[PDB]
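Deviations from the work plan: none for this task. Representative record:
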Amino acid sequence: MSLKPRVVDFDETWNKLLTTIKAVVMLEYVERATWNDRFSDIYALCVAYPEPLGERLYTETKIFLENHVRHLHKRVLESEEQVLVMYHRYWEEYSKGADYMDCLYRYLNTQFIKKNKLTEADLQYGYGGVDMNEPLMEIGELALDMWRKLMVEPLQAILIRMLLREIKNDRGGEDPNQKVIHGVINSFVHVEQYKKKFPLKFYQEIFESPFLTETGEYYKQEASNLLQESNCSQYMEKVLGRLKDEEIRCRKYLHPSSYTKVIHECQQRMVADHLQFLHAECHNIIRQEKKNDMANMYVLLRAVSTGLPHMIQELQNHIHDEGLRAT
Amino acid sequence: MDVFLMIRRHKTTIFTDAKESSTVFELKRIVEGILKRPPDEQRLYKDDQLLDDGKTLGECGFTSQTARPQAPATVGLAFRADDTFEALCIEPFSSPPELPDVMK
Amino acid sequence: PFIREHIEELLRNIRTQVLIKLIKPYTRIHIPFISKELNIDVADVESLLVQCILDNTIHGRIDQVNQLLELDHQKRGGARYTALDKWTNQLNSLNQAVVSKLA
Amino acid sequence: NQLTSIHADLCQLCLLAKCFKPALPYLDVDMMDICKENGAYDAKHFLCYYYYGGMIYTGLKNFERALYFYEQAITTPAMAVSHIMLESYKKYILVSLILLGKVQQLPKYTSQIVGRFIKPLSNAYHELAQVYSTNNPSELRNLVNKHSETFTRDNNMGLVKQCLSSLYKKNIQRLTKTFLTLSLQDMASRVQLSGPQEAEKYVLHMIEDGEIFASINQKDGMVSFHDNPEKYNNPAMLHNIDQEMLKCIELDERLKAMDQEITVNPQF
Amino acid sequence: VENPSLDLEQYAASYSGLMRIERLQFIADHCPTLRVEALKMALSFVQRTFNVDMYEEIHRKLSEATRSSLRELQNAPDAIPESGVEPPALDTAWVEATRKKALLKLEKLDTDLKNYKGNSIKESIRRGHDDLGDHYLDCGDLSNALKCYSRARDYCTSAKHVINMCLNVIKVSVYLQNWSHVLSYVSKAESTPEIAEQRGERDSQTQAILTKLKCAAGLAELAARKYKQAAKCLLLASFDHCDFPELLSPSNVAIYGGLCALATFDRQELQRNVISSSSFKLFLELEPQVRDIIFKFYESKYASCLKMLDEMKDNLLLDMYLAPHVRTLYTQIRNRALIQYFSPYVSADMHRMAAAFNTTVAALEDELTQLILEGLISARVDSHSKILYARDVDQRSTTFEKSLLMGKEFQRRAKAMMLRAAVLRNQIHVKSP
Amino acid sequence: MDGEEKTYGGCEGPDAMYVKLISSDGHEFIVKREHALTSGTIKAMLSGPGQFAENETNEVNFREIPSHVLSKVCMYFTYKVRYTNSSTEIPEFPIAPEIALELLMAANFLDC
């Protein structure tokens, strides 16, 4: 081979190029002697012949990639009651496999079709089991578009339902399993690509929608039951440890892009609508000398927005009436 | 400040960085960790001339204008095939191919 | 020695106040006229008149060849004509910018 | 006062037949909005009209209109060099050197060929403005015999002769700002006129033309240099402003009709 | 001209390296009396850290001043260095000793630099870069000194490391005549320490940091003929550094800033800049000869202020950088004093102005010719009575005519624009070439 | 002669410190690992192939680049890495007319 345009044919290369790609995907090791020779074969093929071979190699690998992702989706559908543990192994094997394919095909993306999906916004492609064609994009971005068609299939009501169940379990403690729960959350964030507007529409419907509804309904039935059963001394200590563990759980499972959104819905069910009961018992705490009971009312009111000046006006009128009674 | 040299021996170059006026014995210790060979068997040469261990690179002719990073200087290498030196002469690079006459 | 270094500036500030109250009535006052009223020599009068005009305190011009302080009451204007020169320079550079956008 | 291909050919007839009388009513008033209906103009007619029109104002002692006419032929963009564009830049330096002392700068929308191809080729004209700033008649005479071969091959004979007498007139006006009543013998040293008798004859030519107002004092052997005692308070000056304002209100009305036409047609 | 009275101890102990040798050679080549002491002190600096480029150039000027009989130095030296002092001579066994000793010091410093890099210590590497940068300057390697200071930028961790590194690049950029690189480095050295630390160097200050950044930038702005920007930054520095090991002397910043602002500012601006500011008062108090210039310029005393200017011109000509600036700054101060003096007047007499400036009637007439074309005044020279009169035009003549000429060009350019846009409508573009 | 040196210092490293580049004429270009990070094709081989990033067997096989072309490529990697993160003089790189036409095709392949 040489840097000059040769006469390398397409049939004498696809038979060996497909063997190296198939033996390297799904987290598989390949020989270094064969991986180094793949870089010299792509450069000597696109420049060969008067017709550019870059437009044919991108369409040839697109058909094989569309028939491989759709075939692997049927295997996971056969196994039931274990979709939350198989999706992590499938995403981890596909993330490492697409990373090695994008590093090898880095020359084809910078030469043939350099634009991405920023100037395109087609809702028909990428959503649904389609094996025809795909929008023009890079190799590293083509694997992310083929991952959205696996969630639109009748399986979102099972994988998401079984994933939010372990997160809702907060009475036991932290943590049951971190490699499995976090392995599914990161698959919905990295799958988002660039479009004509903000890419906060698909991610907010397949993850941020069922999570904010099930979490708000769990803490609502827990704080309301502990208030009518336990006393005020035990109700304040129970909601403090649950809210502290929720912020730690979001730092190891969710993404920093949705930190203030999850903590806002959790505080809207613990201390929010029931402010008539917490503020009524706070008047008797400040009348005496209790350091442990007063500390539970300052931390809970600090997380709630526009809750700090409320306690200031109550403490001001308390010391004003106490000093007038002693005189 | 820093100078770069190449150690060629039978169509096998070795890129090793060193100082401008450093000891000759310090350069042989770097090749030991990459070739798994004792430093007493290697022999550094400069334009077909045996160097000394007590001297330095600045006293021979390794300056900043000669061993530039863009164009290093050739450093000879000789092992121990029996008791004396082994290699001494190397092979130059290949020639450029025929340029396309349609562009000229 | 502290107050001795400032005794010269205090004497010069008094001569400036008297010259203002005497130059208003007299239009073209004589140079030796202000020297006789102040009972001072003519050596420091020529040096004080230069500093008084440069300090934007005494208007007019000093004429040493005639010993007359010129004060043209009906002189040319300078408050309105100074604005027409700035309007011409701004409009000249503006015409070169609006014409360069059409090749 | 419209412009067309016929008006461009009328200026060429005045160049052959030396008679600038019919070219006065067609050039004293500015022209705008060419007559177009089915195609009757070209790019070569727009450059030949401004080049031929500048030669009429040059000989007619009208340097105020010659500078504007020669500036339009240079600002026109192009792709290469041409004979019209070369003669337009060479005459732009000789005209600006008579009024002021330095060549005027070019606008932003000018062609890049003038500053990359015409400028290095016109090295004989660029060096003439450098010596004119020093105001030295001894050094200016050496540049005429040196660049005599360039002025003959570019048919520029006669235009450079006006710059020789302009330096002597500029030195007299320069002494008016510095000096006031200079002697007749001292005026023949800076201007270099060889003898005081030649100084009294050169200052008399500027009085008839109206370039400067001076008075010769033969009783003392000196000459006085006074300014113009005109306060512009005559009633005739007010009529000139009212007559000049009648053309400004008409130019704005014509631009309003052209602006409404573009708004009707669709644009991006 | 030259001046035999000049202190060489302070002028040589201010800089080091190539600047100390170049500043001493310019004095001996210009002052014949201060030639033996200038070449003797310059040869003593070559003993410390030997070299081969600066040891053969100094001896070339000593042989031409003692052996040649065309100069005054002949009755004392007698064409031999054996005359009172014993300067280092140049023989056969000296050109080789000055080269082998300099190469031995380079091999010792280069070997120790490789050991400091293997210890993973960022403090030993940054310290070794300063010793190698100053060693290549005296030897003759001007390109090897910039490679050592550029590698020490990645080993910084404090504010003092950036200031010490940026000050070394300025010394190399001066010899390379890179005035643009000096102005781009003084801004980076002023934002990191936030102007003299974050509290002002505790309470009392012994060596101010702002003075170092303000003195290095004044040398590059003066050589670039920028008297307006150099006189606006030297007033913020205070006398709190006690000389300098490798910078300008504290006795020269008052002259560098005092002479630059005297030509670009009038009398009112001097009382608010170099007088009202308390930072510049400490520098002017050291040299009383510079403070009296501002006071004499405000009291309309141009007669005594001019005589004191030429008295100190012989001392400033002995320098290396201020010497070429004696023909551009002196002509601007004299021209500025004549404009401010003619402002209150309008009919000055030539007989009174010639006796005030210590001149004559023949020299006064020639000064008025260069004051109208170069100055911004408007005076008329009346040779019939030798009295500088004044004849100005009316205010309505220069205003109505200037506005009328602009109005004619406004209508001509507007009507000519319609002709260019007319051919652009019927699809007629450029078809001449 | 004088000066303290270091035995195990400088740029001494094991097999993972230096990489290997196989030419087309049989030459073996062994350079540092930090110098090969300028290109894109060589850096992609170290991150893969493959689930083994480091294994003391890193090598680069170039069947289209001979020996005279890779000779200037290895010198261009040292020139690019050394002349960064500083502010010193940058000399001109000597480029031959017969090599400039070959270096342009190698720069687009190496993504540098």
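Strands of chain C lie at 61-63, 68-70.
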